[model samples]
Target chain A: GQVVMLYINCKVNGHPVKAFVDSGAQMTIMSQACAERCNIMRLVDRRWAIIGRVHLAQVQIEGDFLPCSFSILEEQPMDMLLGLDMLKRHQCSIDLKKNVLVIGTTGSQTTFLPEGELPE
Target chain B: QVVMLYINCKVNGHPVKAFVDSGAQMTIMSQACAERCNIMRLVDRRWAGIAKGVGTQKIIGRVHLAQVQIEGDFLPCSFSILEEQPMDMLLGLDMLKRHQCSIDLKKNVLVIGTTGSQTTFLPEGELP
Candidate 1:
């Protein structure tokens, strides 16, 4: 299968991070290693299940402190997977042909593009 | 931005709800959906794979649906069968790319183009 990969820069607690934008996913997720690296605080005794298991934590991105799911994985291509939950919340439109992510809300909107050519 | 789009499609002429998911690598259907659509008799059990998402992973079996009727066109499709899933089926990137599918967020429609034909699917409502 030909996979269309999109990576966009993000911030967690004012720290730099990148995420894979996935419309197929139901919720936004971060890796355990990512959370630790960013010094994100995990909420105690909170968990949820959709496709896999995820722990709960608060992440500050784009000036908003939002609750997010943290997944423990043996390996992953990226630190975070920005699922449909967040995309819908922000009215995000992914234009693969244009290679951009359009974030729309109320009367304002912002566009994000991948930092560089994807690794071969 | 609480917009979610689900569309009604047919699998061998049986009504099915398909959730558009670009994050997913492969199309998938719940075991119950397979039984309801009599998909088991229509496809062969050939391979098994693991699907990992957010915090969950599952062992899934594979089957090929020779033709999936979408908006007056029949396209070849493959599906992984999982024990339980939130939606009847997910139209992932695999099928989307195979058919040259594109989502129009502003119009809330899914467009698919092939050789000489184009089909559009309108959003039924928010996904459950």
Candidate 2:
């Protein structure tokens, strides 16, 4: 009962986004709702109920900007999750003890907040 | 290098550190872990393929059925044995959803809706 999952504040297209830092995900993904909210619908490939990748997606963490793609899906409640690809790409590490996500590029750190303190 | 969610579990009476991965499509195990647990003989070699996670890895096969001792519950489980997986074992989204499991961070416990059994996550040092 000691370990807790990590959640962080981020920006997707300059709009506030909550990222579930998941090392287990294959690729980063976002909800269809999040894409629409961010006005990135033009990038979505709408062939299937679950859409495909939006290439070279823009996401800003504490101080690092990650250039990757997202697999947009329908009915996703937890939107804009940071996956293994982005985790490895930016050399990110979550330190539960310190409660910070260490961004490896310039050594900037983002504190992981409980959803209650994220302030929407 | 994210801090993963891990829980203490057992396979074939051997203690194991089981990672709970919500993003994983199916549960997986390292070849050595499975062999050490003495479940390699139960693996169904017919179900073989490759698993891709942006990168790819060889999937040896699947263990159609197994029993994982979590807390006081002996839950039914399955797994794909992988050639190069780093973790001892992973409980994927499929298995979590199959057993109606939920990751409740408030109390730091995995709640099993199917059997009402709750499991506590292991501390960092407790991981293998």
Candidate 3:
């Protein structure tokens, strides 16, 4: 599948943090390293009790935080995963052929072109 | 104005707290929430390279809830478990519309008017 490049300016601990766009998975995920670097504290001894076979933990995120659970992954290459958790908030579409990503809020569908030109 | 009811549901087995976040198009759960619920032992692990607003996290496992009680109605639901965290579980559109609700921010509560006439108060956190 073709990946679309998306960018947004966000903040971590009162500091600005630029983020990339991702539409593959569901929910926005963050890196353990970045979480630490940003001094984002973890709410210890707390888990979002769920009725399932898996145990999900909870983290406290402030500042323009849209009220969604985030996590720290033990992976490499990329530091974050901007999944559907935040995407559903707006109307968005992807032009895989053109490598363009369009996102719109307030019921208005906004088209956001990809970083580079589309393939011919 | 669109008063979409964002029902808040707490995990039955864990301490996780989540609202009916339609904004979260995708379903998500923390790894810690999974461990406490013992979901890892029952469900198969699926590798998902996840991205979030702040950063990226890895998905260890997932399980489907045959039926989740929402406004007295059982709705099919599923979510992923992140390894070791303290965020609550989110009920996306899949289970949201099933209950039919509207968010009343002024009251800081969710009203579940199943019968159209009977309104159930979705108690919210007290003001600080």
Candidate 4:
């Protein structure tokens, strides 16, 4: 038995959003709903399925604010899912034993909550 | 970035370390794992795809229905067998949604909604 997903509460453009930390994602993904919620929709312009890329969105985890590029999806229940590109560049580590998403650069960490705690 | 989430599972009575990647749309299995688990004959050639990611790999076939023993519960899931992929097994978002599971970091356990089963995640040393 093991945990299936790594989720953390973080901010995107100052708006609170739950982020799924995924090593399997090729690129970090953001949902249109989250972009709209963050008032970054105007900042997002692209095509179908792939809504476009936001060159740098402030992804705040704890005290560390990471400027990240995102590939937006049209309809995703998840607000944001971090991919390899963002994870690697920042030297992020999803340490399960510690149960923390550690930011290697800033030496800061954030807690993960149960899925039920997330806003529907 | 979340370090890869991994769990120990039983496939055909063999212990397999599965990397849980809910970002993925479908659960995946390596062709070698299928053969070792004695489920290769069950693969249906009718279903296949060129899984796109960093690079494209041929999906060998589909194991229409397979029971994966996670802790105390035997969960039913479908598998897409890949030829060149490295991971032996990957549990995707589809399976997570189907089971209504949750990864609760507070307790460090995977809560299965339907069955109310709670399973702990494997340590880094246990990961592949």
lDDT of each: 0.63, 0.74, 0.43, 0.75
Better of 2 and 4 by DockQ: 4
Please give, for residues B51-122, the per-residue lDDT of candidate 1 as tens digits: 544424453577765577777778888777877788888888777767766554544566664643433444
Listed in order, the DockQ scores are 0.27, 0.10, 0.03, 0.14
Clashing pairs in 4: A2-B120, A2-B121, A94-B3
Q: Which candidate ranks first by lDDT, i.e. highest? A: 4
lDDT (Cα, tens digit) per residue for candidate 2, span B1-128? 33557898899999988887765667888888999999989888887774544336778888878998898888888788887777899887667756767554435576776776888877667877
CA displacement after TM-score superposition, residue A71 of candidate 4 (Å): 13
Docking class of 2: incorrect
Candidate 4 C-alpha lDDT tens digits along B5-117:
67888888988888766567678889989988899988998777644334467888988788889888888887789986678998876677578776554455666767878
Clashes per model (N, Cα, C within 3 A): 9, 0, 56, 3
Better of 2 and 3 by lDDT: 2
Q: Could you give candidate 4's per-residue lDDT for residues A6-120 as a string of tens digits?
A: 6788987788888887756768899888888988876675753477888777889987788888878888888888786776567665554455766767778887667576545
Show where candidate 1 strays beyond 4 Å.
A2-4, A9-16, A26-78, A96-120, B1-3, B49-60, B113-128
lDDT (Cα, 0-100) at A62 in candidate 4 = 83
* Lowest lDDT block of 10, candidate 3 chain B: B119-128
From the highest DockQ down, the ranking of the candidates is 1, 4, 2, 3
lDDT of 3 by residue, B13-106 (tens): 3333454443344466776666665556644475455434233566665565634444444445566665543344654433333444332233
Candidate 2 per-residue C-alpha lDDT over A1-120 given as tens digits, one digit per residue, 9 for 90 to 100: 012346788888888888877756767789888988988888876663467678777788876777767789886778778886676567654444355766755577788776466433
Per candidate, chain B TM-score?
A: 0.80, 0.91, 0.57, 0.90
Clashing pairs in 1: A24-B21, A24-B22, A24-B23, A51-B56, A52-B55, A52-B56, A53-B55, A53-B56, A88-B1
Q: Chain B TM-score, candidate 2?
A: 0.91
